[PDB]
Structure 1
Amino acid sequence: TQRYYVERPIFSHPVLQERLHKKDKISESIGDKLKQAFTCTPKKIRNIIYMFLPITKWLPAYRFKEYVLGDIVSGISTGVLQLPQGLAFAMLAAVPPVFGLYSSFYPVIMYCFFGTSRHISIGPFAVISLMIGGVAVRLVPDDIVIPGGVNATNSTEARDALRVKVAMSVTLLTGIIQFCLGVCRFGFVAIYLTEPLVRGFTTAAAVHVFTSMLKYLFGVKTKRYSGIFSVVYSTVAVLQNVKNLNVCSLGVGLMVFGLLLGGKEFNERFKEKLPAPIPLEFFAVVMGTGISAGFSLHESYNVDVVGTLPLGLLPPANPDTSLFHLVYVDAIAIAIVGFSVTISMAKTLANKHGYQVDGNQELIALGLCNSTGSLFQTFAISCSLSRSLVQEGTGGKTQLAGCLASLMILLVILATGFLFESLPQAVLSAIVIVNLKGMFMQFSDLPFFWRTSKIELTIWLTTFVSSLFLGLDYGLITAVIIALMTVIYRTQSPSYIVLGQLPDTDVYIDIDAYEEVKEVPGIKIFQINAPIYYANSDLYSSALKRKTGVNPAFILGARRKAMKKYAVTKSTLPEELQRFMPPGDNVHTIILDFTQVNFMDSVGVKTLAGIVKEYGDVGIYVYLAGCSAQVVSDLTQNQFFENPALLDLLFHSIHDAVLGSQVREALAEQ
């Protein structure tokens, strides 16, 4: 009445096809399509190095009057937020702290300068140290006693040294293989991640690390389990030794943790420009050590010591590798887990603002930095989330924060060792607990997922359980596999609607949706909100017949019953208008859309041909409207268009198909 005036003559598909003429646009030199490129232009090398290292060009774009102060306080904050954290990681992997310091210093350096993300923090995940601890336990148990001359229970040195050697070697190989699979531009490829996966993974990891660090909170090193229910056995040991252990140390650790929680409460009471997350952990540790020295704790009550730092010189080196023909199992397991860490970190540093970075070269730089750091006495470093938020909030121009963190790393490691020699383990315990309660608290998201959907919550809980109760690597691989297969499941269970012609209109919408809709008699309309593949063809045909009610098999069954009762594209009706037919319907033509369908396969083509030919054999038309050019080619390239009329029975528009069908029906009236 207002618009939508079409009034167009019938143009199904092939009238359009004949209406227009083809293009060619054929490019030459199919082989040397790019050999003509690859010039010696200085701009070419210029962009090559900038996409490799544009530190040459972040120089002038840095003002000072505010950027300097912002980046420096950011560096102070990130250093204080990595040092106890990095040391806790080195302890969770059961490594002498010197290697934690090497890691926190040098790999951070060459990767921060070899890093394209503008705001990006640096700091390993504890899950790293988890890999080390678990695989070391699986390979080096805690009862390894090869006589060396100690003549007592003094194997804590050689065993730790060999474990650390294995760890550095495998971190080397993992950085290397990371490079190896990143060079193929797979930064463009590795995207196969979802937020429920990462969320459930992180939560399960949090529970695991909580359970683990409980032990170092206690002080009684019972045993370190690995594998199926490893955390469960750890808890069992905790419960068995919950009694008659170092109890005063436990009590003081928990009370000081509660006190720092209360301080955090007071800080969170008002958080503004002036309120900042102070390094109160320094106050806690210094007060604890002052009381211990004033009240004889380690020397009398034998309270815990984390590390030991003398005053001297520690030159670096470069050790060798291990027997890969046997350590390949751990090599590959840690390779894929390192991949997972890298891609997770990339995704969480991914597009957040207008600034854009790359993925493949990010990977390359990260893997090379891992390998080199391992050459220089280091495990695999990472980034984090809290430090990242800190740096982005204050200043992330290139890497000033990480530079500052590294320089304070050097400050502590180089000269100051006697004050920074001892440490209670409960210190790092409470530190990581406070660092992680934020991601811990994800209870109010549960009904949010529930009301959100079912498949997504399924994936989230599945990755959670398979990463927590199940092991580590097999668990995460199975989580990924399920994440993949649920896509197929979603494509396998679509939602069907039987369209009905809109009242006094031309649009076709589902009949049983709003109840104020008509439908054209003699015609059945089907729709799919799903593409077609091999795994979804036959259940398709079945469900289609069922929800359409019509069944050509059952049509023939009714025909058989009628025949007992009185006892080439299309076909006709053998019935001579008697009472034997069930007067249920009068349908003459069949309607199906594909405007939603993506593609088919050989199975899809075959089943389509079978169903359409048998329906024509029934004597009922089938009009498969909704093809334009692409699916048209997809079908035609299949070996089934023998140029039938079917080759013409293509409808670019459902409405056009409707109109043509009813027009030819009126034509049949003679």
Structure 2
Amino acid sequence: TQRYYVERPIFSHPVLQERLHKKDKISESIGDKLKQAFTCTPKKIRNIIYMFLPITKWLPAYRFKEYVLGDIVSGISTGVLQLPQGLAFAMLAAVPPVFGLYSSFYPVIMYCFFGTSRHISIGPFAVISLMIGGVAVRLVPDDIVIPGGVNATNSTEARDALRVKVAMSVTLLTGIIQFCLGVCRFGFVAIYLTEPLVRGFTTAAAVHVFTSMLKYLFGVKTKRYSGIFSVVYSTVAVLQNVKNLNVCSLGVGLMVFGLLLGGKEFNERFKEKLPAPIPLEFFAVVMGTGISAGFSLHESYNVDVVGTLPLGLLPPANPDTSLFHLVYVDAIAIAIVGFSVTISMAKTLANKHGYQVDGNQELIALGLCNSTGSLFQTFAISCSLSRSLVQEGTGGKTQLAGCLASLMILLVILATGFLFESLPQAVLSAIVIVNLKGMFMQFSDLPFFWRTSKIELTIWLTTFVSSLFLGLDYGLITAVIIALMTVIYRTQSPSYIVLGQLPDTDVYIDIDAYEEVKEVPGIKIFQINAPIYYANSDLYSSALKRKTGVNPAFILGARRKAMKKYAKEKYPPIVTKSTLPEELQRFMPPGDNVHTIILDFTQVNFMDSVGVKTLAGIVKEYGDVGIYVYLAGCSAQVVSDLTQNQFFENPALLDLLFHSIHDAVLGSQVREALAEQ
């Protein structure tokens, strides 16, 4: 023994209390919890606008070389990546690309004006376009083209306009929902989602996008679904008509994918400055345009392309305020999923470097971005589908990177539409698939969790299967609920243990864990590694009698039958402990004379009324048997709420408390020794 000598007396509970006194419990009384605002405090409003507008630190505090170069490179890279991504998302939405461009341009600006994140390429997300198509098919008629008077071979431009309008309304509704959420300071909801939730959910997103791209890789017009086996029905529909349909589409897709792999190899083997300091993909766009125009293989197979790209911009407009009635549940589900994914992405980036991000600010940012896009004839967007990860590699220090990006995209679209008016619906698909595989290759955590624990497997897999098959919103909600159920199970099946004693110490560990530990006569220890709420209550009593081996009802019956077999030849004026009625006869079973029971509570977080009742029953029962029970851990809450419940008649129950396990041990030893008379 180098140190740690105590020589302190025995403290059960009352020794403490009589040795102690409460201090004051001073608190902030009524009306003193608001005496900060309601005046012209420049500090208060200054800090409020600081947390609302993070901009107030950017231009005043900016670099000259590193910031500029990082912003430029990151913005150009993100824009070149996301432009085909925007096109693909718009075509998935079955809207002309111009709306995708609007989403890529305006909300980026409203975010650069609003949002505390730094390294994130805010843009449209895929499943968003997925539910866009889901509405466009469910709430929007597909094969009912109302004759306006022209009856074109495809007069669906009116149906497309209806799609635009319904997306407009739903995006506005989602934006206002997000704004209302933000003004209520929701960060609690941000943390309820786990890390495996985010990871598996992104996996399901990737597989859904993969399915959609495979469908739109060849041009088979089938039904779109959003229900049970929705992706399954989509893929079987694609399969049932794939044969001898298009070969130019597959050929161009495979060749562009090979070009993309060659670029992967070129930028991955070496990291230089002259050709490209950043792995890009625009040369694929260049070659696709060249093949379509100069080589002119469109008519060589009569293959199709993106089509026409309306050149110009649009004035603002508001959605019609008489149609939101029926489109309510869809809108709210979309807002829920949009926030879930966005704030998830937000935290999963903010956790990275020496910077933190308050979600509520990002929530109001996204709410305003969606509402404004709706006003600006645009659909709502999300944090990222994979580009934000690209943004990470491109070191987008400040938010000016995304601003300059979106400005570059707007300049390109307005000053040019012809150079890319003729691109197929497969090159963008291959780009999307490249991004998907890039973002999924590391989605092989299954061994990590497998070596880690079962529960991570459970939560991962249930999220994956619920989000993939069922609706992304339904998958999300079920996944969150089942994560909470994982928590309750973890605290439902604890690890009951029976402690021993480390010789000549006050340490107590489970006997099954080691051989060096010993036991103490007449004494049993039962440690619980979980609280006792209503649910995790009675099975605790069962496990107690089980591991301890002392079934007190068995004791009573054995005493009764043994005496039968021998027979053939002043306010609570109550004792909280009986004695042994056995008159010391030779019909005793070979049961050890364990006399006292000790339950560790140092690992008990809280307690509750059902638990109070069951502990009272257990204690009274053992006392009736004539077996002592002692409780270790009389700290604050356990005693507080046990006293709150009608548990004590100021009895020796108080004496049954012990602050230390070993303190209880020695108290019991002393009690037994005194009992020796």
TM range (shorter): over 0.9
- CA contact under 8 A between 2:178 and 2:364: conserved in structure 1? yes
Deviation at 1:87, TM superposition (A): 1.6
- Matched with 2:290 is 290
Deviation at 1:37, TM superposition (A): 5.0
- Relative distance call for 1:303 and 1:280 in structure 2 (3 A) is farther
Deviation at 1:61, TM superposition (A): 1.8
- Provide the rounded CA distance (Å) in 2 between the counterparts of 1:58 and 1:75: 16
| Paired residue secondary structure (2:73) | helix
| Paired residue secondary structure (1:513) | coil
- Relative distance call for 1:307 and 1:13 in structure 2 (3 A) is farther
- CA contact under 8 A between 1:200 and 1:464: conserved in structure 2? yes
- Matched with 1:32 is 32
- CA contact under 8 A between 2:119 and 2:395: conserved in structure 1? yes
Instruction: Describe the superposition over 1:322-374 as per-residue Cα deviations: whole angstroms up to 9, x where unpaired.
Output: 52321112122212112212221222222322222322122112111211111
User: Structure 1 regions of 5+ residues with no counterpart?
Assistant: none
- CA contact under 8 A between 1:89 and 1:124: conserved in structure 2? yes
- Relative distance call for 1:468 and 1:392 in structure 2 (3 A) is closer
Instruction: Describe the superposition over 1:484-533 as per-residue Cα deviations: whole angstroms up to 9, x where unpaired.
Output: 11100000011111111212322111111112221011111100000110
- Relative distance call for 1:324 and 1:309 in structure 2 (3 A) is closer
- CA contact under 8 A between 2:71 and 2:398: conserved in structure 1? no
- CA contact under 8 A between 2:288 and 2:423: conserved in structure 1? no
- Mapping of residues 77-92 of structure 1, within 5 Å: 77-92=77-92
- CA contact under 8 A between 1:256 and 1:284: conserved in structure 2? yes
Deviation at 1:615, TM superposition (A): 0.6
Deviation at 1:465, TM superposition (A): 0.9
| Paired residue secondary structure (1:485) | helix
- CA contact under 8 A between 2:220 and 2:242: conserved in structure 1? no
- Provide the rounded CA distance (Å) in 1 between the counterparts of 2:110 and 2:264: 35
Deviation at 1:201, TM superposition (A): 1.2
- Relative distance call for 1:314 and 1:630 in structure 2 (3 A) is closer
Instruction: Describe the superposition over 1:226-280 as per-residue Cα deviations: whole angstroms up to 9, x where unpaired.
Output: 3211211222122221212011332222122123213312322223556747575
- Mapping of residues 438-453 of structure 1, within 5 Å: 438-442=438-442, 444-453=444-453
Deviation at 1:174, TM superposition (A): 0.5
- CA contact under 8 A between 2:342 and 2:383: conserved in structure 1? no
- Relative distance call for 1:543 and 1:272 in structure 2 (3 A) is farther
- Mapping of residues 345-424 of structure 1, within 5 Å: 345-384=345-384, 386-424=386-424
- Relative distance call for 1:78 and 1:598 in structure 2 (3 A) is same
Deviation at 1:188, TM superposition (A): 4.4
- Provide the rounded CA distance (Å) in 2 between the counterparts of 1:338 and 1:385: 12
- Provide the rounded CA distance (Å) in 2 between the counterparts of 1:54 and 1:313: 29
- Relative distance call for 1:542 and 1:101 in structure 2 (3 A) is same
Instruction: Describe the superposition over 1:282-308 as per-residue Cα deviations: whole angstroms up to 9, x where unpaired.
Output: 322322232232344334532222141
Deviation at 1:580, TM superposition (A): 1.4
- CA contact under 8 A between 2:80 and 2:282: conserved in structure 1? no
| Paired residue secondary structure (1:659) | helix
User: Structure 2 regions of 5+ residues with no counterpart?
Assistant: 568-574
Question: What value does the CA root-mean-square deviation take over the aligned residues?
Answer: 2.1
Q: TM-score, normalised by structure 2?
A: 0.95
- Matched with 1:635 is 642
Deviation at 1:556, TM superposition (A): 1.2
Deviation at 1:473, TM superposition (A): 2.1
Deviation at 1:393, TM superposition (A): 4.7
- Relative distance call for 1:355 and 1:296 in structure 2 (3 A) is closer
- CA contact under 8 A between 2:117 and 2:357: conserved in structure 1? yes
- Provide the rounded CA distance (Å) in 2 between the counterparts of 1:147 and 1:58: 54
- CA contact under 8 A between 1:412 and 1:420: conserved in structure 2? no
- Provide the rounded CA distance (Å) in 1 between the counterparts of 2:29 and 2:506: 50
- CA contact under 8 A between 1:615 and 1:621: conserved in structure 2? yes
| More displaced stretch, 145-154 vs 599-608 | 145-154
| Paired residue secondary structure (1:623) | strand
- Provide the rounded CA distance (Å) in 2 between the counterparts of 1:610 and 1:387: 61
- CA contact under 8 A between 1:498 and 1:510: conserved in structure 2? yes
Q: Tell me, yes or no, if structure 1 residue 574 matches structure 2 residue 584.
A: no
- CA contact under 8 A between 2:545 and 2:551: conserved in structure 1? yes
Instruction: Describe the superposition over 1:395-428 as per-residue Cα deviations: whole angstroms up to 9, x where unpaired.
Output: 5443221111111221122221222322211111
| More displaced stretch, 302-311 vs 195-204 | 302-311
Q: Tell me, yes or no, if structure 1 residue 584 matches structure 2 residue 588.
A: no
- Provide the rounded CA distance (Å) in 1 between the counterparts of 2:153 and 2:557: 86
- CA contact under 8 A between 2:111 and 2:369: conserved in structure 1? yes
- Mapping of residues 102-141 of structure 1, within 5 Å: 102-141=102-141
Instruction: Describe the superposition over 1:515-560 as per-residue Cα deviations: whole angstroms up to 9, x where unpaired.
Output: 2221011111100000110011001101111111111111112122
| Paired residue secondary structure (2:325) | helix
- Provide the rounded CA distance (Å) in 1 between the counterparts of 2:234 and 2:354: 46
| Paired residue secondary structure (1:349) | helix
**What percent identity do the matched residue pairs reach?**
100
- Provide the rounded CA distance (Å) in 2 between the counterparts of 1:61 and 1:314: 35
- CA contact under 8 A between 2:267 and 2:278: conserved in structure 1? no
- Provide the rounded CA distance (Å) in 1 between the counterparts of 2:455 and 2:36: 50
- Provide the rounded CA distance (Å) in 1 between the counterparts of 2:561 and 2:627: 19
- Relative distance call for 1:444 and 1:27 in structure 2 (3 A) is closer
- Relative distance call for 1:437 and 1:65 in structure 2 (3 A) is same
| More displaced stretch, 183-192 vs 482-491 | 183-192
- Relative distance call for 1:68 and 1:380 in structure 2 (3 A) is same
- CA contact under 8 A between 1:605 and 1:635: conserved in structure 2? yes
- Provide the rounded CA distance (Å) in 1 between the counterparts of 2:21 and 2:454: 49
Deviation at 1:650, TM superposition (A): 1.2
- Relative distance call for 1:519 and 1:276 in structure 2 (3 A) is farther
- Relative distance call for 1:332 and 1:196 in structure 2 (3 A) is same
- Provide the rounded CA distance (Å) in 2 between the counterparts of 1:212 and 1:256: 18
Instruction: Describe the superposition over 1:584-630 as per-residue Cα deviations: whole angstroms up to 9, x where unpaired.
Output: 21101111110000111100000000110111111110001112223
- Provide the rounded CA distance (Å) in 1 between the counterparts of 2:277 and 2:147: 50
- CA contact under 8 A between 2:606 and 2:637: conserved in structure 1? no
- Provide the rounded CA distance (Å) in 1 between the counterparts of 2:232 and 2:36: 63
- CA contact under 8 A between 1:169 and 1:322: conserved in structure 2? no
Q: TM-score, normalised by structure 1?
A: 0.95
- CA contact under 8 A between 1:534 and 1:601: conserved in structure 2? yes
- CA contact under 8 A between 2:172 and 2:375: conserved in structure 1? yes
- Relative distance call for 1:37 and 1:163 in structure 2 (3 A) is closer
| More displaced stretch, 431-440 vs 142-151 | 142-151
- Provide the rounded CA distance (Å) in 2 between the counterparts of 1:237 and 1:36: 63
Instruction: Describe the superposition over 1:26-62 as per-residue Cα deviations: whole angstroms up to 9, x where unpaired.
Output: 3464134323654422222211111111423322321
- Relative distance call for 1:310 and 1:7 in structure 2 (3 A) is closer
Instruction: Describe the superposition over 1:62-104 as per-residue Cα deviations: whole angstroms up to 9, x where unpaired.
Output: 1213322221122111111221112211111111111111111
| More displaced stretch, 389-398 vs 38-47 | 389-398
Q: Tell me, yes or no, if structure 1 residue 189 matches structure 2 residue 189.
A: yes
- Relative distance call for 1:248 and 1:390 in structure 2 (3 A) is closer
- Provide the rounded CA distance (Å) in 2 between the counterparts of 1:576 and 1:606: 32
Deviation at 1:392, TM superposition (A): 4.4
- CA contact under 8 A between 1:67 and 1:395: conserved in structure 2? no
- CA contact under 8 A between 1:187 and 1:363: conserved in structure 2? no
- Provide the rounded CA distance (Å) in 2 between the counterparts of 1:368 and 1:324: 19
- CA contact under 8 A between 1:62 and 1:397: conserved in structure 2? no
| More displaced stretch, 603-612 vs 309-318 | 309-318
- Matched with 1:149 is 149
- Relative distance call for 1:4 and 1:61 in structure 2 (3 A) is same
- Provide the rounded CA distance (Å) in 2 between the counterparts of 1:586 and 1:247: 86
How many residues are matched? 670
- Provide the rounded CA distance (Å) in 2 between the counterparts of 1:444 and 1:55: 38
- CA contact under 8 A between 1:524 and 1:589: conserved in structure 2? yes
- Provide the rounded CA distance (Å) in 1 between the counterparts of 2:275 and 2:641: 64
- Relative distance call for 1:181 and 1:314 in structure 2 (3 A) is closer
- Relative distance call for 1:363 and 1:148 in structure 2 (3 A) is same
- CA contact under 8 A between 2:598 and 2:632: conserved in structure 1? yes
- CA contact under 8 A between 2:107 and 2:372: conserved in structure 1? yes
- Matched with 2:498 is 498
Deviation at 1:642, TM superposition (A): 1.6
- Provide the rounded CA distance (Å) in 2 between the counterparts of 1:72 and 1:262: 25
Deviation at 1:313, TM superposition (A): 5.9
- Provide the rounded CA distance (Å) in 2 between the counterparts of 1:541 and 1:443: 43
